[PDB]
């Protein structure tokens, strides 16, 4: 008894597989995990080093990029071109390097109560004024005041590395 | 080679096309195939229910589409119009309704448009409705007196009615609409579980009889201990 | 956008791998088949997290094929582009029709009709580039783009970008 | 009770055909451009819910004949009841 | 009419389907007929 | 999964695996020998109850 | 004889003249001057044969600006004959006009909206239209041109980019030329119009000819419970 809403980031209509509420493999309800570029970079590299450690058992941008590239080749198999482009893109477009900086950013933005998608954009796109954020992220409209967004953006730039 | 997952038919859900779906399914050389440039299954393009249609008309009022049943000859105006339902008879490929006066009874022919309109007014909701595709290659505007239009419609209706061991496995070895046989299954939106031998034979999949009454899994607990 | 998604997959093992170490081959198949693959429903599946905790349910032997089908549950980071989202990337190709912006494992195509009227294509500069009074867009130039539409096929994703709106274009 | 032999005779030794079926509607109305690895069932506007099944060519003809007969045999790859 | 109402325009017509189509022996013998029946007042 | 013709299919199923260069822990004759010594790493999922061929 | 009837009559006359040809005006005006006209009488009035009157009556019936009524007649000294009468059903004509006007305006509005969208692409050889999104997945390995799947030939851009102002002008012209209909419809909606039938239409009857064969009367069969489609009014 089943037969035949277009996806739109601005309206927070992310589709069917990326709904706000998710069910993990344990059956426990969980909140959709959306990662900013800095958070995603840490997650990918942390998994790669752990994978490298398992296999063995059985900083400026240039040096980090080379270190990531060598690690990627060692701990990945064939058809890894997509991941190579991703790590290069992530390293050259992130805003927070260390885990402590990322942790502070998550703590800061978790008090806003916005959608997981919107908070990920905030930590992924650099903005100067609330007007720029509002036009770049339409979902923020009628959800957060300009004064609240202005202080958040200023604080976000405070913790930006270098 | 196809990238789509390979599955087995677990259910056959009979139904009936909606006019929207026929137009949506239709792709129109478009039926090398010009539609897929192929392997080509065949692309569609754009009489057995006369007794069912007659029964439905008798079982419901022919003006408001509200349930009355066949013997009833009054709407019993509960919401209703109060009109006296006619006695419907099947003549050729047409339905004729007769009204008894309050002195031969009045007679007229229930036009297919009238029947369709009434059926649309009647309150499976998804797969088969009372109101409800050119096979692929592998398989009134001006004048037109009523007599001419009626003859053309009759001819069109008549034409439509007329138109309607090679493997080691075998080497070592050596109640559903489909099982019964289909029009009735589509009308009732019959769901066939394909649990019988006939359904699997038709669909060319292993039957659940003999060597097929179970599944052979692979166990890793024994594999580790075998070395 | 990047996500962490709980996914499932149906891996198939040839009978040649039916040894006491078939689980190891399943992990290798999962990495060599899923990582880098573009699933249009879930996006570019990038990396697999918890590589030592993948769930391998009991396999099922196909009737005639002889292989064993395994239902594998894993956690992976997947990049899914959405229309109306703002992304940053480096231009990789330029042409009269438009230029391509590389965003992670995805490429965003910006057509002429989606560019401001001020920008004009010019092949005189080597390589060819789009020149405007305020700046010039060419290969290796950082661009901020807004995805105006995505066509997610079964195993392929393509998007069209726009830079006409305010606060977009070169950074 | 030789199911494997029965399937081989019906399919391997006779007409065996592979078709693509939409996951929303069970009809075999999926346009599969396999060269470019693209599938689409126009009518459902979907491209990520396509399954492929192996059925006898006679079965494919019977369903298409039923389809041309105003009968919708919707093959489904999962159970409901 | 239904489509017009949904579109927000007042329809001047209506669906035709909504239209509605609409003793014991008398001992007093010799004087049975002359008298009229004044049942009510 | 309830907590804890078959011979024909198991022999044929393992015979196909052996013919496809599967490891031998002991093609139809090889499968029969494995069954005799209880070295067929398969479980029959009777329709359900899973029963190991060894037991 | 309320002014509402005159207003509706003006709306019908303007609609017929503006959206139909010449002979259509002749046919509908005759049934507007005469409440009900027989088929034979209408032919004599306009001096047009059956074939010419065919398309006119059929087209006007399709848009429901006119209604038909068939009844059996029993002339005193002739065989029974089924006669045809034409008359205007105002509630249906107004509703049909309102919906048709809305559809035309909506269609032009949709066309104007669509034109502002990106042009697209089409293949010169096979004449297959590719959208901007669809063509972006067909570009060759060199990222130079879009290649048709069927022909493997470079695609060519679509036209209609410069027609943006043309559609707006077309929409402006229609609304300027359709203002009388909107004003008439507003007045009609303000008041209420009773449904018209053959019997009611006969009241405002002006006989066309001295000795017309058709009898402009209505004598329904006594005690006939039979009901025909589209033959009843509130
Ligand atoms: Zn084809
Ligand atoms: Zn009724
Ligand atoms: Zn479909
Ligand atoms: Zn072409």
UniProtKB/Swiss-Prot annotation, chain A:
What function is annotated for this protein? DNA-dependent RNA polymerase catalyzes the transcription of DNA into RNA using the four ribonucleoside triphosphates as substrates. Component of RNA polymerase II which synthesizes mRNA precursors and many functional non-coding RNAs. Pol II is the central component of the basal RNA polymerase II transcription machinery. It is composed of mobile elements that move relative to each other. RPB4 is part of a subcomplex with RPB7 that binds to a pocket formed by RPB1, RPB2 and RPB6 at the base of the clamp element.
PANTHER family, sorted: DNA-DIRECTED RNA POLYMERASE II
* UniProt xrefs under Pfam families: RNA_pol_Rpb4 (PF03874)
**Family named by the database record:** Belongs to the eukaryotic RPB4 RNA polymerase subunit family.
Any one annotated GO CC term: cytoplasm
Single Gene Ontology BP term? nuclear-transcribed mRNA catabolic process, deadenylation-dependent decay
- Kindly state the subunit structure of this protein: Component of the RNA polymerase II (Pol II) complex consisting of 12 subunits. RPB4 and RPB7 form a dissociable subcomplex associated with the 10-subunit Pol II core complex. In exponentially proliferating cells, only approximately 20 % of the Pol II complexes contain the RPB4-RPB7 subcomplex. In starving cells, that enter stationary phase, RPB4-RPB7 is associated with Pol II in a stoechiometric manner. The RPB4-RPB7 subcomplex probably associates with TFG1. Interacts with LSM2 and PAT1.
Where found in the cell?
Nucleus; Cytoplasm; Cytoplasm, P-body
Q: Does the keyword Cytoplasm apply?
A: yes
Curated annotation (Swiss-Prot), chain B:
**Residues that, per the record, bind Zn(2+) 2:** 61, 64, 75, 81
- Compartments, as annotated in UniProt: Nucleus
Q: How is it modified after translation?
A: The tandem 7 residues repeats in the C-terminal domain (CTD) can be highly phosphorylated. The phosphorylation activates Pol II. Phosphorylation occurs mainly at residues 'Ser-2' and 'Ser-5' of the heptapeptide repeat. The phosphorylated form of Pol II appears to carry, on average, one phosphate per repeat. The phosphorylation state is believed to result from the balanced action of site-specific CTD kinases and phosphatases, and a 'CTD code' that specifies the position of Pol II within the transcription cycle has been proposed.
Where Zn(2+) 1 binds, per the record, is at 33, 36, 40, 43
Q: Where are the transmembrane segments?
A: none
Domain annotation text?
The C-terminal domain (CTD) serves as a platform for assembly of factors that regulate transcription initiation, elongation, termination and mRNA processing.
Record note on quaternary structure: Component of the RNA polymerase II (Pol II) complex consisting of 12 subunits. Interacts with DEF1; the interaction is direct and serves to bridge RPB1 to the Elongin complex in a DNA-damaged dependent manner. Interacts with the Elongin subunit ELA1. Interacts with the Elongin subunit ELC1. Interacts with ASK10. Interacts with ESS1. Interacts with RTT103. Interacts with SHE2.
Give the protein family: Belongs to the RNA polymerase beta' chain family.
Question: Can you say what this protein is called?
Answer: DNA-directed RNA polymerase II subunit RPB1
Curated annotation (Swiss-Prot), chain F:
Subunit and interaction comment: Component of the RNA polymerase I (Pol I), RNA polymerase II (Pol II) and RNA polymerase III (Pol III) complexes. Component of the RNA polymerase I (Pol I) complex consisting of 14 subunits: RPA135, RPA190, RPC40, RPA14, RPB5, RPO26, RPA43, RPB8, RPA12, RPB10, RPC19, RPC10, RPA49 and RPA34. The complex is composed of a horseshoe-shaped core containing ten subunits (RPA135, RPA190, RPB5, RPO26, RPB8, RPB10, RPC10, RPA12, RPC19 and RPC40) where RPA135 and RPA190 form the DNA-binding cleft.
The entry's protein name is: DNA-directed RNA polymerases I, II, and III subunit RPABC2
Q: Where is this region: Leucine-zipper?
A: 27-42
Family of the protein in this entry: Belongs to the archaeal Rpo6/eukaryotic RPB6 RNA polymerase subunit family.
In terms of the whole protein, what range is present? 73 to 150 of 155
Where, subcellularly, is it found?
Cytoplasm; Nucleus
Q: What else is known?
A: Present with 6090 molecules/cell in log phase SD medium.
Q: Specify the taxonomic lineage.
A: Eukaryota, Fungi, Dikarya, Ascomycota, Saccharomycotina
Q: What is the top-level taxon of the source organism?
A: Eukaryota
Species name: Saccharomyces cerevisiae (strain ATCC 204508 / S288c)
UniProtKB/Swiss-Prot annotation, chain G:
Asked if Transferase is a keyword of the record, the answer is no
Alphabetical UniProt keywords: Metal-binding, Nucleus, Transcription, Transcription regulation, Zinc, Zinc-finger
Q: Which residues form the HTH TFE/IIEalpha-type domain?
A: 8-98
What is its subcellular localisation? Nucleus
Q: Where are the zinc fingers (C4-type)?
A: 123-151
Miscellaneous field: Present with 35900 molecules/cell in log phase SD medium.
> What family classification does the UniProt entry report for this protein?
Belongs to the TFIIE alpha subunit family.
Protein name, UniProt field: Transcription initiation factor IIE subunit alpha
Q: Which organism is it from?
A: Saccharomyces cerevisiae (strain ATCC 204508 / S288c) (Baker's yeast)
Native organism taxonomy:
Eukaryota, Fungi, Dikarya, Ascomycota, Saccharomycotina
